[model samples]
Target: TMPRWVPLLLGLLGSTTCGMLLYAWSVFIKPLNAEFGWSRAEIAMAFAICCLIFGLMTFPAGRLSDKMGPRKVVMTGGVLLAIGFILSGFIQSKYQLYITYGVIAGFGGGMIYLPPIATAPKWWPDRRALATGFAVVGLGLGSFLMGPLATYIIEKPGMGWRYVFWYCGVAMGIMALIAGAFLEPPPAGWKPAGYTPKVTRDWTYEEAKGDTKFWLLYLAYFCGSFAGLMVIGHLAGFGRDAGLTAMAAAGAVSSLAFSNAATRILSGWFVDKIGIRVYFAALFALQTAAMIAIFQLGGSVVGLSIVAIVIGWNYGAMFTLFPATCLQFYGPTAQGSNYGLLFTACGLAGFAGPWVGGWLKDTTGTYYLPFLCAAALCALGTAIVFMTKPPEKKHALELEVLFQ
Candidate 1:
């Protein structure tokens, strides 16, 4: 039999490999822009659709994975992702890009993304927060490592942009399959012999939805994600627009990915020790300031790098913090489905972030207004998080007279 830690490692590797594909969209923006002479808005719509579908699909994918195993869902998702990416190089119009890259590749990406996020918590219930970070850190690192690599390959000896798609699709897809094969949920009714969490009741999906606390968590997640998605979707282009060289611009994105990966792991451990509420306040305070400060950072290449680290680190924390908060509030019995609903907030934010960035740039001729607006949203989130109360443990079930 495999060792206890093996499943966790599998989920980790799967997240990293899938992430390599996920973060590659920004690097492709410039090349596609040059080739088609499409407006930034037009080019970005494709990316927006891809992100939207990536978010929208998470609900069904998570629901399915909860019923079946993540391995099969993830494996199929990996294959579909490769197919969509491989087909992307052939598109002649923006609409085709929307269908193939956006819808097909998107569904595939969502499939690959959720397995690790949904499965890791079950395997490491004791260290759920930290384990989640360690596993999903791959997703962040994928962008860090892949962004520069894709740029290099796309700029290579006549290999061209399409080649980059082919290269990443095949490579990342294969690895996703390999790692996803090892991912499995913990056995039914299994619990750690000695571990005890503050909350013990498993709220049904509908019950959790009917309660007020769920919506509060929903709004908090949405507000925070709305700001980060913009940074994630367009920061590299922002870097290039700000006078960075192509390589330097790509580096800005890579830099964001680097801090994002590190902070996710740190946030995981931080939540475990300090509690989610404490970390939420601290992270959001920094995020609100960083979002506002980011508007002033577009004057030079190094400026982009600064925002990448400061803003990117804060954005990456959501992947861990939100899920940790979910498990704590709803309990883990139905985490895959309950958290799936919460995960959709990222999708909604994903669409708004990129599309708004594109639309704002088209109207204003710069990202200043868009970035400022995002800062305001993050500030709102900072306030909303303060009102949230962690769920309290329920009284044990029995009649006082009869049971005693």
Candidate 2:
């Protein structure tokens, strides 16, 4: 078998490109408006549509990961993603943006995004949380590095905004190809060199359907992810709306992405070092208060940047927590497909956050209402995660004897 770290590194490389698709779009917003004179709300809707497709695709993508392995699936996505971005340069209508970037690019991105996160548990059963976190850290870094670099290239004197995708798409495709070549799962019957379960139960994904813990985890995941996405989907625009210069708004996006990248690494380590329960409680509570700050603080350049880092750090890291939790919930067997079911939470959040944020902005001329809604969701999310108490159960035979 290949060393465990090799797959993790490949995942990181694959994820960096996927991250670019998710987090770097804000840099294109004002430029698109400059070219087409489209309203920010209109552009926001298009971006949200991309996220929706990305989230929904994860459902099937997860199953693909299980059946085909991530190498084939991710490699396919990379090439398609490159084609989608190249096609996006030809858009003449807002509808075309929806078709090219939204549907085509979104599907391609969905293929690359989650497989690595899901597959990490299989390769590094011992460091499941940390491995997943490190793999996903590349996603965050893609934004961290690409956002500013893209912003610079897009704004340069001879560069059209469309060229940004041409360059990025080529890079993304290359990265995926390289990572795909390297990635492979452990050999059959593989186990970590030394490991033992502290808490043991092999809950089938189907069996998890009726459990209270499942739904509770589901709701908490939805609420928290939904709240974060609201901020992410509109962060750069929010900076612009708050009266920052164009470059300043782009910088705000880059900063938030940087914080997001760091948090993914740290949160994974934190979950390993700090107890999961305590880490989640603090995370959700911080998110609650952070949203409150964002509602009030989004009125200036510095305020917007500060809150970007804060919100980006807390919100982005939460996704890393999820894969580890899935390993805990259902074990590593059937992990890829099982977690994908749980991960549709992102699909819902992706749809709700962008669409609602755009709808509210178009209707009310203010993003304040969306921020208010996010804050409340964070509050509810905090309570749900904090109050969780793991269930205790007797052995099946012992329970039968006791009943008899």
Clashing residue pair totals per candidate (backbone < 3 A): 0, 0
The global C-alpha lDDT for each of the candidates, from Candidate 1 onward, is: 0.77, 0.76
Model 2 agreement with the true structure over 34-59: per-residue lDDT tens digits: 87778877876777788888878877
- Kindly report which residue stretches of model 2 are placed more than 4 angstroms away from their true locations once superposed: 148-159, 194-201, 232-254, 294-306, 358-368, 390-404
Best by TM-score: 1
What TM-score does candidate 1 get on C-alpha atoms?
0.86
TM-score of each: 0.86, 0.84
lDDT of 1 at 303: 77
Q: Considering only N, C-alpha and C atoms within 3 Å, which residue pairs clash in candidate 2?
A: none
Cand. 2 TM to true fold: 0.84
